[PDB]
Symmetry: D2
Subunit: 178 residues, 4 copies
């Protein structure tokens, strides 16, 4: 059972469920009367995206982006290639970026600019996970789930070689599988 590959659980299932419910409540109050559109980057965000949206008692829309790197450029600039762009015209709408994890914040910042260029009336950022230590880009995080140490984690959408996304918790795999 993939859970046996985990050497440590950082955030439990109930901790996750609770926070998502918490964030959903906050966002629900903050976007009352707004025109909320949730946007996340595949594939890791679908987990949090599905959970957060059900926690938001507001009429809202959902869309996704699929990106790819240009190589070294991306690594140091966060500049990425658009593989699947969002279909909903966010012009004049209140967009909330939904991330699974913020690390360097480079790609997030780049995508933020791109989304801005499409004139949304509002543009905020919500993430379930955040690694402050790794932060090497100026990104304002409006909503944040948990600050985790600098380790490679899996679960709740986060994978390693496409596996472990289905774990109900956030944990660290054994080095052997790394």
């Amino acid at each position: 059972s993939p859970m046996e590959d985990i050497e440590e659980i950082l955030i439990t299932e109930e901790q996750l469920k609770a926070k998502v419910k918490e964030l959903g409540e906050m966002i629900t109050r903050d976007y009352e009367g707004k025109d909320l559109v949730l946007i996340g980057v595949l594939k890791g965000a679908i987990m949090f995206m599905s959970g957060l949206s059900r926690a938001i008692d507001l009429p809202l829309s959902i869309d996704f982006l699929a990106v790819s790197s240009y190589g070294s450029s991306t690594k140091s600039s966060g500049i990425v290639k658009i593989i699947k762009d969002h279909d909903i015209d966010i012009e004049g709408k209140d967009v909330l970026i939904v991330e699974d994890i913020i690390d360097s914040g480079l790609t997030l910042a780049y995508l933020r600019e791109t989304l801005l260029g499409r004139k949304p009336r509002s543009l905020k950022i919500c993430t379930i996970l955040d690694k402050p230590e790794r932060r090497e880009a100026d990104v304002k995080v409006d909503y944040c789930g948990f600050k985790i140490p600098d380790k490679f984690v899996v679960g709740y959408g986060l994978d390693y070689a496409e596996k472990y996304r289905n774990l109900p918790f956030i944990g660290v795999l054994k080095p052997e599988l790394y």
Copy 2:
């Protein structure tokens, strides 16, 4: 509250949670030792995809397709345009198609053929919702959640003009909003 726009609940939240858990158990037993890859079509499938995968205690992978219609052709042939193809090479892998709802079964059958052309060792179909009455294509459904009557439903991923995907149940909107 979007739930007030609903004139009737067909499948409750607990009914959904229960079935997804049920299906996950079945699939878990059936894919023991297999090389399971879950594939769904955006955007409606992310809800069921996220829930079903967590209900499957097996190492597994997830990927998505994004499609668009060619017009009348699609309507009568199910032939669609690929907007976002799956990234994982499914050659020799046990693929399980994850649908939110099977209606005519036309697009599902078309996409099934395309997926077959990529030589997966196995290719099955799982859906949370199914409208038998509308079925106008020969599609073998291996796993099925609930058979619903011929009505336009929303919730758990299903939308209407991009809204209602975040409802925790499957229901029918009031005709006024239609």
Copy 3:
């Protein structure tokens, strides 16, 4: 085809000469640089093909395929990226290749998007240009021909996906649209 055409504005030989001319200029202007031609499908493929073969320099070629978001496109030129370029343009000298410049809205938008990827330099080239229709800043560095505000077809330009293959630039009979 040559039956729904009200009049021919630019001949095939006219197009060839101008392409050779623009190619020669770019060869001189970009000598010693890391040149990348980026055209916007589908219309730009004729010009892209003819211009690149007329540039006597080592260069790369890539394309963008875009789509409209609705009215947000008509008024602000904001578009959806359906196919992005694969070549990493950071530190490179990019030359946008266009079939025709009109309002300049979409062009202005894509221009900013590419700048977002930090190219060393970014210029714009188009075979056709409709001056009296401009409604966006955008500087055009290389331009083939200035034309009146008529619906033209040919050399890549279509009407309902037709006429792109005409080897000349012609005016479509208004009755056809």
Copy 4:
């Protein structure tokens, strides 16, 4: 550019004549049909441009952009669709336009995919063909030139994204690769 070339196999005028010839044949063969040219980027744009302008018929043009899945591509020619065609080809007469046919694996695969969309007819056209390398059925209806098994560049064909713009077909010096 013309410095890393070991030898020239086909001149620019040679390419032009053949394109005109293939265009004339297709004009005769497809008269009265609903023709749709579909080329595979990036390599096919030169030939696509030259061939379409040499077909004196009303036609449509579209493109496919593909990517590899890994080894599954090398052995079975199975590819990932990065950019699909927008034109609905059902009931239409499609002509796949290729820059070069080698093993024929990817071509065979895309061919089946397009057939899946029920076109009235489906034929294949290529400017270049390497016979001794074929490792897939696939019938070629229109072919420009047969060439030996050498790595060629030019008229759309590249090596590391370079040389597509050469106006002739040349053999790349082995040292360069």
